[PDB]
Write a protein that binds this ligand. Structure first.
Ligand SMILES: OC[C@H]1O[C@@H](O[C@H]2[C@@H](OC[C@H]3O[C@@H](O)[C@H](O)[C@@H](O)[C@@H]3O[C@@H]3O[C@H](CO)[C@@H](O)[C@H](O)[C@H]3O)OC[C@@H](O)[C@@H]2O)[C@H](O)[C@@H](O)[C@H]1O
Ligand SMILES: [Mg+2]
Length: 340
């Protein structure tokens, strides 16, 4: 019986990621990492604006690596932990559902070499023991997502679910994460914990190898920017959405159904979105097809928002954080009103 997790998630309309913020990796061991990729310092007002538009759930990606002390304690710098807590608390103040992750650890220590399992598990657990202790008294609306796209960057199968040995390592790491958090007790005894596949990949072989914990208070996170050629800019990419590629969404979702949803395992899409390609009407249609597909089984998603829209880079921006106005209200309306 995993129905507690389903009940919690059912309270979410749609979610929103505070992207390129606490996950940013500049600035070294400093709170200034937050602004190192060009975003303004997060404020209560920024978070309020997200909530008010209809995104009542927020994912707060955080990269800890450069804020950690030496092994084996990996102590999180006090100033950084305090800042992370301030940002989470903006959301708590507004009664929001929240996901706290670890993020670009994958640029640093989180490289999925199966021969390094012990060091990997131990580092993950050490960070999560500290996070869990810090957030022990926070209510069930705060959820933890152990890893983000864990993988071996630059490997042949980096973006296709890795190798079988890597997927075994992911299973061990998911367990380490759950164990570390549960061992801290308090509200962490039954907090929703959100594990993942290798790379947050949803291909059939990747899902077939995912071990499902016996802990009843878990969910499985995937990232599904599907189809890639619509949502990203690449050789072969396009900006038109007429429905003809809805099958890409359907086929992938039927695997998520086969291995997770139809087995009663909670699933959360912790990142998706489409880069802005002067194609508002197409993105609106894609959201209909994509979010509409998730809604069939009440699966929730969180939209990636990096505050990039007018300038160069990956144009996932939705909230103009400096102005507290939305870059594209038609796109935003399609997300927040998905269930009407
Ligand atoms: O530039 C070459 C460089 O890529 C490095 O990774 C980046 C790269 O995209 C990988 C994508 O490749 C397509 O051919 C894949 O089909 C697609 O599924 C995958 O894109 C990644 O997709 C993820 C979601 O499933 C998403 O969160 C992620 O952002 C997306 O990358 O270009 C996009 C960047 O985001 C990647 O970091 C790779 O490490 C490097 O060695 C080299 O191949
Ligand atoms: Mg309790």
């Amino acid at each position: 019986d995993r129905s507690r997790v389903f009940d919690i998630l059912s309270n979410i309309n749609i979610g929103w990621n505070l992207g390129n913020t606490l996950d940013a990796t500049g600035g070294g061991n400093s709170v200034n990492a937050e602004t190192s990729w060009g975003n303004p310092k997060t404020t209560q007002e920024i978070v309020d604006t997200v909530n008010d538009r209809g995104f009542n759930a927020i994912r707060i990606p955080v990269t800890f690596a450069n804020h950690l002390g030496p092994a084996p304690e990996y102590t999180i710098s006090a100033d950084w932990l305090a800042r992370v807590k301030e940002v989470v608390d903006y959301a708590v103040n507004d009664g929001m559902y929240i996901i706290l992750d670890t993020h670009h650890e994958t640029n640093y220590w989180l490289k999925t070499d199966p021969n390094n399992e012990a060091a990997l598990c131990e580092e993950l657990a050490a960070i999560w023991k500290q996070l869990a202790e810090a957030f022990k008294d926070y209510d069930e609306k705060l959820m933890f997502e152990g890893m983000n796209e864990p993988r071996m960057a630059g490997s042949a199968k980096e973006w296709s679910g890795g190798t079988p040995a890597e997927r075994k390592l992911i299973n061990a790491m998911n367990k380490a994460f759950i164990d570390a958090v549960r061992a801290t007790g308090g509200n962490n005894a039954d907090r929703v914990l959100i594990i993942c596949t290798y790379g947050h990949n949803s291909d059939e072989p990747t899902l077939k190898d995912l071990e499902i914990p016996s802990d009843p208070n878990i969910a499985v996170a995937l990232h599904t920017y599907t189809p890639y050629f619509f949502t990203y800019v690449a050789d072969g990419s396009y900006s038109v959405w007429n429905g003809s590629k809805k099958n890409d969404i359907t086929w992938q979702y039927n695997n998520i159904k086969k291995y997770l949803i139809d087995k009663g395992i909670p699933v959360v899409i912790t990142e998706t979105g489409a880069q802005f390609k002067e194609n508002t009407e197409d993105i609106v249609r894609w959201i209909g097809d994509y979010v509409g597909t998730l809604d069939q089984d009440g699966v929730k998603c969180f939209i990636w928002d990096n505050n990039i829209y007018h300038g160069n880079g990956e144009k996932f921006g939705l909230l103009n954080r400096s102005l507290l106005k939305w870059y594209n209200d038609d796109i935003v309306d399609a997300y927040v009103n998905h269930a009407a």
